Design a protein around this ligand. Structure first.
Ligand SMILES: [Cl-]
Ligand code: NA
Length: 206
């Protein structure tokens, strides 16, 4: 089932319950590796007709955001937001085909490895979240010259510009994700130096 984060507890959500809750919304967005969930709080506030789901393997930083969104609207609550505990390697089947848009913003650790190497098992799982014709956007600011040791630690020692035009594109394509050619929540987390290293990768679910 879907592990909904409700403060410092989990509530199990069935597919039926999830479908009824998203059923009145024009679009569904999933933020994978949401971290503290700020992207979800910002997007749900900005887009009342979008249902926004933030997913992270670590629920602890989402305990308080998940309380904040439950308040009545005049106290800042967001009935179009939801936080879920899950790892990208083991996403719940109840989320299959739910999302018009999936974002992976400034991933770290295993999720950064998964989207840049990439790890095809994680790519297939991300693809399964997306409705046919929906979109995935991966945003990273890791710098090949400043972050050499972090890249090595993550198994990303072989990243080159040619990788992003060939092997990576083909791996995403084989997983059903076809490639498509800063005042955002994630842009506000970047130092000036990191801003020059931003790479945005966009794909359509096919
Ligand atoms: Cl963010
Ligand atoms: Na993200």
């Amino acid at each position: 089932m879907v592990k909904q984060i409700r403060g410092s507890t989990i509530w199990q959500l069935t597919r039926e319950e999830l479908e009824e809750r998203i059923s009145t919304y024009r679009e569904v967005a999933i933020d994978l590796g949401t971290g503290d969930g700020r992207f979800v709080l910002d997007l749900a506030k900005l887009e009342a007709d979008t249902f926004v789901i933030g997913i992270d393997a670590n629920a602890k930083p989402l305990e308080k955001p998940s309380v904040k969104i439950t308040r009545k609207p005049a106290k800042g609550g967001l009935p179009n937001a939801l936080f879920v505990q899950a790892a990208a390697e083991d996403l719940p089947s109840e989320l299959a085909s739910v999302a018009d848009s999936v974002t992976v913003n400034l991933p770290w650790g295993s999720l950064l490895r998964a989207v840049l190497l990439p790890d095809s098992e994680v790519l297939r799982g991300i693809r399964r979240l997306v409705k046919p014709g929906g979109e995935l956007e991966v945003v990273t600011a890791i710098d090949p010259v400043r972050d050499l040791q972090e890249l090595a630690r993550l198994g990303l020692s072989q990243l080159t510009e040619q990788h992003f035009e060939t092997d990576l594109v083909q791996a995403y394509r084989n997983a059903g994700l076809e490639r498509g050619k800063i005042e955002t929540t994630w842009g506000k987390r970047l130092s000036r130096s990191s801003e020059r290293s931003v790479r945005r990768l966009r794909f359509t679910a096919v």
